[PDB]
C-alpha cells in the first residue's frame with residue numbers, strides 16, 4: 154500500500170535540481186516501491202528532434218532467446234552483427250516483429266507472457282551515447298552531478314552504462330530480466346520516443362524473499378553464484394510472483410517519462426514496440442550503506458565492482474575504521490528516506 158509505485162509531476166523549479174528532487178520523492182515514500190515515475194514539466198525537452206539519428210550505429214544488437222515454462226524462464230543472448238537505427242527500426246516495425254493487435258494493457262501483457270519463448274526479438278542494447286543536446290541542464294543523464302561522480306573524480310575509473318549513459322533500442326517483446334542495479338545503485342531511465350516500456354517492481358523490503366524464491370527455482374544457478382540474478386537472465390511472471398506471495402507492482406512508462414529505480418529495488422519488464430531509452434546509474438548518501446552491503450557476482454570476470462572506500466572515508470568518517478576492520482554491523486532499514494530529505 155505504501156509500497157505502491159508513485160508518479161510525480163514536478164514544476165520546472167522543482168525539476169531544476171536533480172538530487173534535491175530525488176530527496177523530495179523519498180520524503181513522500183517513493184523509494185518503498187523500489188520504482189517511481191517522474192513526468193517532467195511539459196515545457197522541458199531533452200532534444201529538439203529525433204529525425205537526425207537514423208545513421209547511429211548499434212554496435213552489438215542482441216537476439217533474446219528465452220527457454221522455460223510455467224512462468225519461469227531463462228534468457229540467452231546471441232549477439233548479432235552491427236546495424237543502424239534505420240535498419241533496426243525496419244525490422245522492429247516489420248510484420249514479423251511488430252506489436253500485435255490489442256485493446257488494454259492486460260491483453261498485451263497476456264500476449265507477452267504467452268509468446269515470450271517464440272519468435273526471438275532483437276534488442277539494441279547497451280549503446281554508449283546520449284541523445285540529450287549539450288545545452289540541456291535539467292535531468293541530463295550524462296551529467297547528473299551526484300556523489301557517484303566520486304568514482305571518476307577520485308580514480309579516473311569510468312564504468313560504461315554505470316557512470317556514463319547507455320541507449321536501448323527496443324522492439325516488441327524485448328525484455329529486461331529481474332535484477333537490482335550493480336552495487337545496488339539507483340538508476341534513471343528516460344524513454345526518448347516510441348512505444349511504451351512496462352515495468353514490474355518488488356519493494357526493497359521484500360527483495361530477499363524474491364531471492365529465496367529464485368534460488369528455489371534455479372538451484373544449479375544459485376549454487377554456481379549466489380548473486381546469479383545479476384546475470385540478468387532470469388524471467389519470472391507476475392502469476393508466479395502472486396502464487397508464491399511475493400508483493401509486486403506494475404507500471405507502464407510512456408515516451409517523455411522518467412523511471413527511477415531505487416537501491417535494492419528488483420525490477421523487470423518489457424518493451425511494447427519500437428522505442429529508445431537512455432539510462433545510467435546514480436547515488437545519494439542513502440545508497441552508501443547498500444553499496445557496502447551489496448552481494449556481488451564473482452563467477453564472471455568483468456563484473457561491476459566499485460570500491461566503497463572513498464564513500465565510507467568521506468561520508469562515514471566515524472565508521473571508516475570499524476568498516477575497514479570488517480566490523481561494521483549497520484542493518485539497513487529500507488523504509489527510511491535519504492539524509493538529504495530532512496529539508497522536506
Ligand SMILES: O=C(O)c1ccnc(-c2ccnc(NCc3cccnc3)n2)c1
Nearest residue numbers: 313314315321328329334335385430457
Ligand atoms: O532494458 C531496459 O530498459 C532496462 C531497464 C532497467 N534496467 C536495465 C538494466 C539492464 C542491465 N543492467 C542494469 N543495471 C546494471 C548495469 C550494469 C552495467 C551497465 N548498465 C547497467 N539495468 C535495463
Ligand SMILES: [Cl-]
Nearest residue numbers: 154155156488
Ligand atoms: Cl508501514
Ligand SMILES: [Cl-]
Nearest residue numbers: 242243246247
Ligand atoms: Cl519503419
Ligand SMILES: [Cl-]
Nearest residue numbers: 459460461462
Ligand atoms: Cl572496497
Ligand SMILES: [Fe+2]
Nearest residue numbers: 332333334340
Ligand atoms: Fe536496471
Ligand SMILES: [Zn+2]
Nearest residue numbers: 378450452453
Ligand atoms: Zn555470477
